[PDB]
Amino acid sequence: GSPTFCQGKADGLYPNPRERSSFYSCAAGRLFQQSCPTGLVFSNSCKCCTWNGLVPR
């Protein structure tokens, strides 16, 4: 059948299965797969991507 991955889903970002810093994004039930390239990391708590503020060095 047709893919149901974003069907009925609310908007916002969802976690990716393989790459280091890409995400899934849902907009009006349509799926986008995009990257967060520079300093940006995905946060599962906000369904958003944000700049990393923690330096462990």
Curated annotation (Swiss-Prot):
* Annotated Chitin-binding type-2 domain residues: 4-52
Top-level lineage group: Eukaryota
Subcellular localization is given as:
Secreted; Lysosome
Disulfide cross-links: 36-49
**Expression tissues:** Detected in spleen. Secreted by cultured macrophages.
Which function does this protein serve? Degrades chitin, chitotriose and chitobiose. May participate in the defense against nematodes and other pathogens. Isoform 3 has no enzymatic activity.
Q: How does it assemble?
A: Monomer.
The UniProt entry's sequence similarity note says: Belongs to the glycosyl hydrolase 18 family. Chitinase class II subfamily.
| Other noteworthy facts | Very high plasma levels of CHIT1 are found in patients with Gaucher disease type 1 (GD I). Can be used as diagnostic aid and to evaluate the success of treatment that brings levels back to normal.
Q: What is this protein called?
A: Chitotriosidase-1
Origin organism lineage: Eukaryota, Metazoa, Chordata, Craniata, Vertebrata
